[PDB]
User: Fold Glutamate receptor 2 from Rattus norvegicus.
Amino acid sequence: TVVVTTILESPYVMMKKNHEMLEGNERYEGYCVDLAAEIAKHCGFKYKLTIVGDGKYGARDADTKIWNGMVGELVYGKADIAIAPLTITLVREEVIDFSKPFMSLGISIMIKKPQKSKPGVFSFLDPLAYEIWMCIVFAYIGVSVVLFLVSRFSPYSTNEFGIFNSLWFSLGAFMQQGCDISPRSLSGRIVGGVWWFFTLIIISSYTANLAAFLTVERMVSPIESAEDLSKQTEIAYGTLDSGSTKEFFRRSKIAVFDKMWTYMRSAEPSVFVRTTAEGVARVRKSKGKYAYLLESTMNEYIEQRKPCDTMKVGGNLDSKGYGIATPKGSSLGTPVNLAVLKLSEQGVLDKLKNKWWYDKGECGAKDSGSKEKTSALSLSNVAGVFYILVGGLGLAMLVALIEFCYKSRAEAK
Amino acid sequence: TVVVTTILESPYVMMKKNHEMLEGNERYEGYCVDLAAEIAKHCGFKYKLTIVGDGKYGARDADTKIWNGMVGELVYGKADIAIAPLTITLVREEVIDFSKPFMSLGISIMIKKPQKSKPGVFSFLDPLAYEIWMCIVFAYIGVSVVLFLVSRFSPYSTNEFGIFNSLWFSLGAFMQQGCDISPRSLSGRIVGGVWWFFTLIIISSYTANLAAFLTVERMVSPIESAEDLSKQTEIAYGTLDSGSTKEFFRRSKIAVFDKMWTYMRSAEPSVFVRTTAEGVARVRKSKGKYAYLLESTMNEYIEQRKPCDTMKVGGNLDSKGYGIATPKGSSLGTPVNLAVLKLSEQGVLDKLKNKWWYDKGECGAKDSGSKEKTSALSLSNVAGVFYILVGGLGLAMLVALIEFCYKSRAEAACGRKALTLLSSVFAVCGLGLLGIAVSTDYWLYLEEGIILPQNQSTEVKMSLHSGLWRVCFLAGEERGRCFTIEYVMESTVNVLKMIRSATPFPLVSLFFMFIGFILSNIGHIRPHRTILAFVSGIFFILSGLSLVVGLVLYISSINDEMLNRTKDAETYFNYKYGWSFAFAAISFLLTESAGVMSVYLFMKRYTAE
Amino acid sequence: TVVVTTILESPYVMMKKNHEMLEGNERYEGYCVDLAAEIAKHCGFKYKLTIVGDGKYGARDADTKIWNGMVGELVYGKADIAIAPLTITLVREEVIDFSKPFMSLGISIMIKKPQKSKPGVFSFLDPLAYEIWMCIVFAYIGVSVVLFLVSRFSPYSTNEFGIFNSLWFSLGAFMQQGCDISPRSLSGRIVGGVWWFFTLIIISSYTANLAAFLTVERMVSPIESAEDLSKQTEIAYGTLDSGSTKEFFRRSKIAVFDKMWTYMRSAEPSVFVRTTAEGVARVRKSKGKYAYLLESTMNEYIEQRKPCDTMKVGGNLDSKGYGIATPKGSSLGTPVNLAVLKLSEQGVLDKLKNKWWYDKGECGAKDSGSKEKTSALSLSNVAGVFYILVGGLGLAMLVALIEFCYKSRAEAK
Amino acid sequence: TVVVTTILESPYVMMKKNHEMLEGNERYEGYCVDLAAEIAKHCGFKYKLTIVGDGKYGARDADTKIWNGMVGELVYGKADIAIAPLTITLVREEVIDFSKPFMSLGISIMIKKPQKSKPGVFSFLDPLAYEIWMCIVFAYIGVSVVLFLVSRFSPYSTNEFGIFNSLWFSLGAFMQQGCDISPRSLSGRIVGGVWWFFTLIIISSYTANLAAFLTVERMVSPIESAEDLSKQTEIAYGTLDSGSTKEFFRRSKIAVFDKMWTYMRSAEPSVFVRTTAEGVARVRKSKGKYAYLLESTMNEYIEQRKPCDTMKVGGNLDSKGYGIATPKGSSLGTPVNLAVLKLSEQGVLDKLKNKWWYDKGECGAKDSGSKEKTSALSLSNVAGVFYILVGGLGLAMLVALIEFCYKSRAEAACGRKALTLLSSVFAVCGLGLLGIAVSTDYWLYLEEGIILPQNQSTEVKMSLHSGLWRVCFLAGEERGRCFTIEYVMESTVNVLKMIRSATPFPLVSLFFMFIGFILSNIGHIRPHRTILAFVSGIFFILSGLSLVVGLVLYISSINDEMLNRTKDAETYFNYKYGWSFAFAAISFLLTESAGVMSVYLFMKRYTAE
Assistant:
């Protein structure tokens, strides 16, 4: 009767563990297998599934114009019905008829799930912004100068506040340490009064936000909704060859899409890859270097199956449709055409969409909820404080030598 | 000639600077109007534009289902061809003809993009309450004076703690920055000891509650995944009605979408809005209380127009399409259908799709420069700490100039005469302002009332000022009761019983200045045998310590009754201290200062002996 | 045909806002109204709802044996069918027949939702337990004694460490303050070394947990699962009279239930109350003093309708059933009996249970999620630190007087 | 005579101390056995007990539905009356006769009641890592020696910073408790300045991460409401099969219950357990990884028996009933049915229901004394801080006794001779132990492997020790490669490239002691013109500072590669430092100490000049 030309892709058609055990036509299962079984029995015919294992979705090729895989069986007439995740396009439509779309999808960007970032060397000063650390050092100099200028005028023979000691008094006040010298005037002690109140807020502010950083973790979304793709050029975009995602970016006319296809041709080495499962694996080996653009409902499934290290970003960048491919003027097409619309209008198809993607198990708020213990700080989190310390240790020894020069040139005294 | 129907929706159809001056189809301008000329010339028919009367897209009711909108204009024979952002759905597919889609689109949430409220300049002191900072300074004055009275006792040697030193020790101890010297006496170490235990808890409490603010601020997550939009009833969400967004969520078979239509049906008031511009405006007014569901292409254009206060969250919830539509039986429809694809195969659809969208870059790319995700404090957080620091330096220069002038004149009897009279003035003003304050019944205000949400702000229901002896009721039902606390009249009377818990301590403080000033009167007549002045000064110092206990008893007895209200969002609350509270707080300053001066009166006059 | 004797209780039967506007028999609505409409139409008859407004559920009374309310209409035959939230019991069964239960419930304890507690005067020392604050003071004395005994033996004429100063050195080290004296021996400085490391952990530990208290709020469940009821005797239990919850505790035989009925009779003044809505209001005026035991599915509804200040605690303490009451040897009972079981076996009844309680709106994780801003500390939260301070201020003045006694008795020197 | 069938379930049917010795129906004992005698005497029939062969309650399969269990014993005519905790359901109601319920009950979750793990005695230092506390002490030694070399320079007056003072200043500065004196020199203020900035960050980092521990500990909520049980896949939940709990969740119409049966059907392995005792035992073994669904009455009895490690959470999910059952057509059933109600109307049901339940109070009411909800720290949290405090005091007394003896002998040439030789021994041991360490390739261990969940613990897959110059591979596939880092062979090789990033700093440190000891050899021959000894001591002090940079470069380059692993729970990891890491760390201590002694060699011998 009918010969089903299709490919197995999770979760459309899958290979059951009952391969050698269960014989017959129920050895392969999936969302596409039920909808093929629904479309055949409401029409009346019965299915002969066979998967040509070349793997190519297929487009009309360059310089030879050969339909590669499932389309090649469907064009040359060696199979009759094609229930498969196959895209309806213009060059696809002209050779052979199509049904109405299963669901609505788009070209979807797939990346590695963001992790804990590499802690920077100077990442300890993250709780306070750049303008505050400048205004702390600027006010450090300013309060020291005002304390210096105050202490000169007022004797009430030992004025212990030089400009060098006034820097030292305010520095020890900033670092919560005790200083031996104290101001001995009403005009001086007000400077010590407001500067001590300056430190008590800021040091508590640094402790508060650093507690806020370690308690609540917030990971960056590196590339968002394809305008951030257009500017960031450290990542390598990736798509599948012999398919619709190849030819649509070849058909780029939007300026943001024209930026892509220039880089998609001019790149190294992944101009294209050959399997979505290879593309899933290439993302998981990338660790942020590479992204693989693919079908949206394919992208949604891999994020729900639980290695959990993949993330769909933004939204769809196109609109495409999965329809039952049929020969041009099919023996079965118009009965399939109404019965595809019949399953949609009573929500059996959307129930099948609810069925297959939900039952596989989820990776959502369940692991983000209570699979965290907050880690101890590593050496990397506070590494630069050691470098400033030992860098201060070497710089102190350098000024020790320049002191020996100026002390010895007391010579000819 | 043909008829072209449109809906007045930005940016597809726009108005003109010559809204009434200009002629013909050139009355309007827009993406669809430019698209309609493209459909016209390639096919070969002149077009006359028309407008739908109602301004709604298309509605199918449980009814005779005459579509109220552009569709019924298009079906029943008023109009010929529609050039509009009409959504292609299967319900509309069976009743009219659609071409291939000329644009790709989806449902997208538009929320109010959160304007950062730059906080108060003095927002650093928000972890503590303003009553606490009042009680810290009241404790700072008291510990300095008590350490003065401990140190400067009558047989005391080499005890350097004057009042200027005792003020400087407690300020150094409170800031944890060390100090010059330590008290070399057993009672001096006790007052230093409890103050060290005081400053340990308060700074640790301030650091911990400031950590409590910043963790709760980071735990707040903006709603973007549309499951957060479904589960958060604090943000209300509605759609444009008589369209396709209302149709999509109605017959949906996604469980999160099912709860959305369940919410949007049974919501009150009717969240459905008949036009997009008012639906944008409800997001603007609500300040993030309301959200709006619409197409993605409309959401992007409203974003890049410049109020720049609306952002798109999440992604396309589905992928529908826009298509030029003709009724069943139109001979023009198949020449229309290939003409749309003809404009597709040269990008003339996509050239116009770029043109109106890039040209409105009037927003200045606010999204480009304001999404660097940063949770560090800004200078707007700790601004007043710099402002106190600047105000301290300019004050200290002002003290430096007056000290420079006063020292030159002094180096180029007065102490005894002026200080005796000035402490005498401070004693009467201290006793009098508290005696007014206990008599006055304007201690605390309350304004219980009920909130009002939208087009609607607030409504008071009850008000009373209050006193320590007796209540005196206010403009709630205009009942002028000075009704005693023993005489009842709820939670507000429960406050009034708890106000009575702090009754004796001001009356105890009133007695100690009363014995304080009268013993001050005795030494003013006869200066000799000078013991009584030092005794009287102790009664001044111990008086203010009781009033510190009096205020701390009073304020804590208000704050728990504030907390004791069952927290309903609809019943707002107000409370405020009064002039007599200021009369008592000022009387604390005059009483302790007269306590210091009367010891200096003893120090000068024991030398006179 | 049939006359429905029942009472309106939310959400069983409710009064619609379309009272004067909508006439006919749809002026009252609810879960019980649908199930009455389901049981009547599958049997064939049509309903005449009328609510005898006396309010009593009714039991066979003391000393007169009168069936009070809905049972009185059902016993004396002035009404025929009774679709109502009525409990099936022995004395109920003997006079008139009953159907199979709607749902399964129990006697359920209802309390005020716990709030922020009153902060204690000495609640500042909550982050560290009782054993630590003893071991801090015990080690405060111990390290001071060891520092005292060390400094006596080693000159390398001015031994500045007395027992009084050694207490003062370790106290200033505990309070993060700077002390003027310093140890001047290797045996002494080790004592200052480990004591300084003692304070740095503990003061940071106090700051860390007090931040943990203010960030995460955790409110006590005061009384849990009816054994904590049996021991706590500051709360007043409450039930409704003229009903099943009255008579079941009268039928107490379990020892934990025998504790209840002694207190339920011997109390003041709420031995019983007269309305569940009065009992809901009495809990909301109680603020923790009083609890109202009631029907479980009634208790579940009030917690979902949103004043939100009620909480069901623990679990059910009994099992009871809501059935359609029928006359003894009813004209309709056995057709009702099968059709009650018919609605249960195909889950229409459980769908009606899903319908009415869910649609009213919820008060769950939605307000606990993001309707919190953490408050500023009040004066009450740190109140006792002021009392210890001013209590230290008065105690310092007392030792100032006892110093004057011992100084003046240097007399006869 | 009649036949009575039972299931061996606690506490309803129990065994006997005479398991085989005693005779008849008295072979067993229990609540149902005592209930069966009550049914016997009031009706008037003698009873013979029997046991079901399988031990399952009752199963209805999609099958011929012969009930496999006590029901099929009761239906088909093997047994007459059942006295058992059989649940009354509508499926069982149509096939046999049930009396009125004699007990009320519900489904209740039993989880493992969490045993508190009393933490490590030194668990206070858990916010930082043990590499950090190693680097703090390494920085503490270095800053003290550098401040010594800065202060004790050759023309220096009155500079009191000896090495015993410089050790005491940095310890006072690190603990933020103030200090005795401050460095009165410009280079001395620099080394004090960066150390003050060091101790500011580390203490604030320790306080913040300790706050991070206690907030995350409080955010963990135990699963009790059964919606948390449904949504948390980390705790697996299953039921007793062939009963009524399996039947109830199967055909349920509650949406949270629907996901439960969806989970319990498709779970792997089969969570259904054929007996309750093994179903209790799976909760015991899993240590809170597994949960069990059962009746409330069985859950309470297992709780009050004393392992006391199982608690009940939530409430009764429904309210089913237990009833004495007879088949259809039993003449005894209506005399049975009124006899159950006869025992109800005297509480004889309820008297027996009290009796077995109060008598097993062997648990000692663990729930009564362990649910005072308390989140304060215990002494078990900060225990080692007391233990360090106790160990410090006993050490200080030990220093006090030896100082008392040494001072008496000394008060009742030696410095120059001993210190010169001891620094010479320390120099060779410092250079030699590092030279072994650079040569040795046992720096760091790794054990990559895969976990195993249950009846199953761990399995290694790969192992390698490693060196700075070259790797030397280990028992992963038994391949003895001392394969150089330039020669590749994944994430573990990515570690090996990052180990090479810290290569020069130990080799730089190896050169500086090599120039250090040789310049030390020159002064040993000729003491005169003593400048070179002070120069050589600087090369010792600067050598250890480079090795501090060498270790900090090395340790940070390991920790990020630890973090760089994609975190899979199934692939566990191990890492550990080696003997050569200890050889380098010990060599730091000898190098800085010889740096101090060679300055003292200069201080003594400049006095000799």
